[PDB]
Structures are given as C-alpha cells and as structure tokens.
Amino acid sequence: MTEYKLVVVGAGGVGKSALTIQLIQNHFVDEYDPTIEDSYRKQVVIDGETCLLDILDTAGQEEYSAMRDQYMRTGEGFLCVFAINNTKSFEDIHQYREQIKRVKDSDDVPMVLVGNKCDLAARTVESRQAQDLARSYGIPYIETSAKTRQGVEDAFYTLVREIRQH
Amino acid sequence: MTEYKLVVVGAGGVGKSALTIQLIQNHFVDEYDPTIEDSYRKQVVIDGETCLLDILDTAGQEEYSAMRDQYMRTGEGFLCVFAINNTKSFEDIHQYREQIKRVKDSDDVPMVLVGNKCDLAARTVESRQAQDLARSYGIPYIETSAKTRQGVEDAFYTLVREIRQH
Ligand SMILES: Nc1nc2c(ncn2[C@@H]2O[C@H](COP(=O)(O)OP(=O)(O)CP(=O)(O)O)[C@@H](O)[C@H]2O)c(=O)[nH]1
Ligand SMILES: Nc1nc2c(ncn2[C@@H]2O[C@H](COP(=O)(O)OP(=O)(O)CP(=O)(O)O)[C@@H](O)[C@H]2O)c(=O)[nH]1
Ligand SMILES: [Mg+2]
Ligand SMILES: [Mg+2]
Known about the structure:
alpha/beta; binds phosphomethylphosphonic acid guanylate ester; binds magnesium ion; S-nitrosylation (chains A, B); GTP binding (chains A, B)
C-alpha cells in the first residue's frame, strides 16, 4: 500500500508529541516527557485510499542540528508546529523551513504550518501573522488543539493531500 | 469581517443540500426535496480568523444552464460534488468545471472535488479514479458523508483555505 512518511518538527514544548498521540492513540498527554525520536505507524483510510502513515516525532532540542538532516532527507511531508502562546516558537519556524529546503534541494516541499494550543486564551501570536507567513511560504496554515482534538485530523490529512499533489 | 462566498454544485441527488445542512444545522436530511436556490450565512472561526461563510446551495437540474453563469461569476470557491455510487454524477463533474472556468475566465479557480455518500457500500466510482481526476485539475479530492458527518468540515474548510491561497 501507499505509505506516507510524515515528520513533525518544531521547537521544544509546542506539542509535537501530544498532536501525534492524539492522532494515533486518541488521548491528550499532559506530562513532561521530552522526545529523543519516536516512530508511529498506522494503517488508515484517507479519502477512500487505504494507506500507511509512518510518522516521525522529533526532539525540539538543538543537540545534533545536523542529525535533523537525516530525517529531513527521508521525510515526504512536514508538519511545522509552533504554539500560539509562544512567540519564540513562531520565530523558530523560519529556521526549520530553511533547513528542510536546504537538505531536500527544494523550494516547495509538502508542508503545513500548524499553530497549536489554540484552546489557550493567553495568545501571543495573532492568526493573521501566521496566515501571512504561511501565504509567503505558499503552504496551508491550520490551528490545532491536542487538548480538545480540534484540527488534529485536519492538519495530518491536509499534509497527506499536499503530498498527493506534489 | 472577511466573507467567503462558497458555491455547492453537482448533479441532481448527490447530496449538495445534505452536506450544507450538516455543516450549518448539524443534522442529516433524509427526504426528497429538490433545491431551486438556497442561501446560508454563518459566522465561524476558521484557523483563528473570524469569518462569514456565505454558502449558495444550487439546483442539480438543467433548466437555465445559463442561469448558473450568474452564480458562477460571483462565487469565490466551489465544492464540486458527485456521489460515489453514481457514475453519471462523476462524469458530469467535467461539465461543471468547464462551465466555471469559462465564466470566470480562469484555469485555476478555488475548487474541491468532493466524493459524497462514502458511507454507502455499493460503490461504483473508485477513489483512485477520482484522485486521478482531481490531480489533473490540480485540486484536492475529499470524500464525505453527510449521513455520518465524515469529512464535511474538512471539505468546506479546505475550500476556504484554497481561497486564502489564491
Ligand atoms: N493546552 C494545551 N496544551 C498542550 C497542547 N499540546 C500540547 N500541550 C502541552 O504542552 C506540553 C508539551 O507537550 P509535548 O507534546 O510534550 O511537546 P513537545 O513539543 O512534543 C516537547 P519535546 O520537543 O521536548 O519533544 C505538555 O504539557 C502538553 O500537554 C495543546 O494543544 N494545548
Ligand atoms: N447515505 C447517504 N445518503 C446521502 C448523503 N448525502 C445525501 N444523501 C441522500 O441523498 C438524497 C439526496 O440528497 P439532497 O441533499 O437532497 O441532494 P441534492 O444533491 O441536494 C438534490 P437537488 O440537486 O435536487 O438539489 C437524500 O435522500 C439524502 O438523504 C450521504 O452522504 N450518504
Ligand atoms: Mg515530544
Ligand atoms: Mg439540493
């Protein structure tokens, strides 16, 4: 079957893992548990196509920024995640997109810009700012909440459809 | 606020109305009720943006194919709907896309190809066939069920994001 190799990247603490576990295990993780590297594989049916989601959940931390090259080379699509209550994480996006373009030798790589933790009221990144950024990259912007599950399927399945159209 | 003028088109009986009412009124209509023309307006929040969905629900029938020109000229994005258990409706898609391109003087108009009634088992249109068609048009393909609500938000919000990126 068709397999889609998806990679979830973004700064430390933005909710990369909570998003992925919401998708695979249907529950919200609320505990401190820094990721090194985790793989999840799941058979799903998207828009009638039977397929396998091979998802790589990555570390937010800097140790070995060049060990990101290896998982960036292999990934077919990327969810670039920031948290709407953390401005630095939004600013960091630029660095992950440039690194992905650099290792994949490409100005258009399947990507979705995800603004997570949209359930929180202490918002510091405006949606308009993020939508403008997404538009300059030519990629979708989706807001999600791993807490309420709002937008999680949408974020992942839109990325699969972007890969379908590459 | 930003308003998005969406238009739902497709052959008679494919579920254009049931899709729209699922979205606006959250329930499945299961009765015979041919549409002439209906408007629905709803304030929503999509990916953090407050906006108004102005949705036009159209007739499947032929009387006045040129009275489609008027609503095609004004629409910003189109959901092109067929039913996965009705091959003729899938074939009819081509005619609605060509008419939209013709009146909007454009080879790329915000559009989503929707394969509705995916809950039904008597499938006559394969997903692969539809995905190939969608790919040749360069637009997303989404399967929906107005009966189970599967994919309805996805179909509409993906169309809004396509308008955002035009
Ligand atoms: N309110 C709320 N909290 C969230 C959401 N997603 C994640 N969190 C919380 O943020 C914290 C960090 O989540 P986690 O998934 O571990 O983030 P990470 O980005 O994967 C962390 P690391 O980079 O080290 O691997 C946790 O307390 C988690 O419950 C969300 O959508 N909303
Ligand atoms: N199983 C199932 N039935 C559906 C679904 N969507 C619509 N239907 C059924 O199909 C029939 C036609 O639906 P309706 O919404 O009236 O279709 P229409 O395309 O709007 C008809 P018209 O073109 O004349 O305006 C109804 O019996 C409705 O319940 C669906 O997703 N699955
Ligand atoms: Mg993690
Ligand atoms: Mg109708």
